[PDB]
Amino acid sequence: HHMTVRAISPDITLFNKTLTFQEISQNTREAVIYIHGGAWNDPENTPNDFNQLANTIKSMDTESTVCQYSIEYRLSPEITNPRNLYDAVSNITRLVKEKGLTNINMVGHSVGATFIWQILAALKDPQEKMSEAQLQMLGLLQIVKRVFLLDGIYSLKELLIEYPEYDCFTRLAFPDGIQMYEEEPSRVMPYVKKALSRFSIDMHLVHSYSDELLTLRQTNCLISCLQDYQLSFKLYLDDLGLHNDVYKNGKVAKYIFDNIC
Amino acid sequence: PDITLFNKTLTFQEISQNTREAVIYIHGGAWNDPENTPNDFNQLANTIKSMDTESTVCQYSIEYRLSPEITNPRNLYDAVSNITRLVKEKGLTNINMVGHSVGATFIWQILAALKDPQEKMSEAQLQMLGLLQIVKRVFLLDGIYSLKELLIEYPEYDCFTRLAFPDGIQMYEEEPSRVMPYVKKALSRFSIDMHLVHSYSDELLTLRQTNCLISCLQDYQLSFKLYLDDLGLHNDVYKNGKVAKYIFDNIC
Ligand SMILES: [Cl-]
């Protein structure tokens, strides 16, 4: 009996903080895995951020074809890039093995979308050089069907040009300089192109016109690069509320549910 | 006689017990190409019909006279008249418009109809208003939205724009930067879902037309969806199975 992952010890990477919003059952065909954002640093953003959205999806999913989980990762300033990402990768890898997830749809908001973007860029390193975390990334690419990137951060460089004030958090996640971020679109797009084609991954980009913390600049800089490399993607722009309303928004739930098909 | 070519309307999937949505297609052809016809969408529509296991969709494809014999906005007005008559004759309650090339231009022009007040609208414009009242979704495939941008990018396309705009492209009334405020009114007043589609393999149009439209949409905070892919050359886009899937999955 119980009240759903097999807790491990020690649990350095916070696998035990994984939430289940909708468990696997007889008719389950697709998995949704959520990654919360919060600027690498905000302890108020948790895997429970997506509770409302997941529950709206669970309602619409009248045949129970969807299972849904949300992962945790350690925060800056103590854990810095790419170690927060590697926690999420580690935790997702364990979850897939434990539940036998054959495929997955990744949903991320803010820095969670950043992590998914970083995973999509993993082919930047050849198999001869890949670290254990990078090999796990390759492993996830092999099973990802779609990603949904909600009001994401893709270019640290462009983020600091637009928002010098955001140094207050980026200096914590990138303590040796943001130039240490390896996944600038203009540098890694050729590898993301290879990954989406090789693994047949569908990319969905979502942004809110009302997002007070990020303008459309990040989105448009990504789109411009995606276009230049002729990567297929889908974009959805709407009034989906404030930055932290987007991952609770019923129109976002609908968008995700309707596009898992 | 059948001046506007209503009798050339094709039915791809007639109404059924179960029909809830209508799809109406408008072929393109740069205003003038007689090789584009309502059959352009036969393949796509038959694929959607097959996807539509429960017969919730009906589908029709319309015709309109070509330039140089007729010029803007009279080609549009044929399409409008023909759709209006079809809607009346079949009792179509809602509609999903799908346009390719200038067929998408037409749909865009319909979306900008509130540029004229009710007191000033012509009969064709009043018909456009009546379409706005029942349109649920539009799917704009590799369209032309700005004549000004089109000749900036391709001065050589004067060879067909001079046929449809014989007194000059300045007579085009629907430049996005000019009419976006009215499109904004329409989309909100009526709850219309806009989908923009372009092919990376389109040899006739780069992404400029699409990007110029997006920039303007974003400036007015108009909701829309975009789908970019390799969907073939310009006149193959409307036959691509990925387009068929995109449309069907988005009528929900
Ligand atoms: Cl008139």
Ligand 1 centre distance from Cα of residue B151 (Å)? 28
Say what the alpha-carbon torsion angle A127, A132, A133, A136 is, to the nearest 10 degrees.
70
Which of B170-205 are b and which e, b meaning 16 or more Cβ less than 10 Å from the residue's Cβ?
eebebbbeebbebbbbbbeebebbbbbbbbbebeeb
Nearest CA in chain B to A251: B223
Residues of B at the A interface, defined by Cβ within 8 angstroms: 200, 207, 211, 217-218, 221, 223-230, 249-250, 252
Delineate the domains of chain B, giving CATH numbers in brackets. Answer: 1-252 (3.40.50.1820)
Nearest CA in chain B to A224: B211
- Pairing between β-strand B57-62 and β-strand B135-141 as defined by DSSP bridges: unpaired
The rounded distance, in Å, linking the Cα atoms of B54 and B72 is: 40
The rounded distance, in Å, linking the Cα atoms of B147 and B228 is: 22
Size of interface A-B (CB pairs under 8 A): 38
Catalytic site residue B191? no
- 3-state SS of A189-243 is HHHHHHHHHHHCCEEEEEEECCCCCCCCHHHHHHHHHHHHCCCCEEEEEECCCCH
* Experimental technique: X-ray
Taking an 8 Å cut-off on Cβ atoms, the answer to whether A209 and B227 are in contact is: no
The rounded distance, in Å, linking the Cα atoms of A48 and A34 is: 10
Catalytic site residue A110? yes
The rounded distance, in Å, linking the Cα atoms of B99 and B26 is: 5
Taking an 8 Å cut-off on Cβ atoms, the answer to whether B229 and A232 are in contact is: yes
Taking an 8 Å cut-off on Cβ atoms, the answer to whether B230 and A226 are in contact is: no
Please, what is the end-to-end C-alpha distance for chain B in angstroms? 39
Catalytic site residue A207? no
- A56: distance to nearest CA of chain B, Å? 17
Tell me A247's DSSP state: G
Tokens of A70: 């949300």
Contact predicate A168/A177, CB 8 Å: no
- Residue appearing with tokens 């004759």: B89
Per DSSP, the three-state class of A171 is helix
Backbone φ and ψ of B193, nearest 5°: -85, 120
Q: Please tell me what resolution, in angstroms, this structure has.
A: 1.9
Instruction: Provide the CA B141 distance to its chain's centre, in angstroms.
Output: 8
Residue tagged active-site, from B67, B81, B101, B146: B101
Amino acid at residue number B239 = K
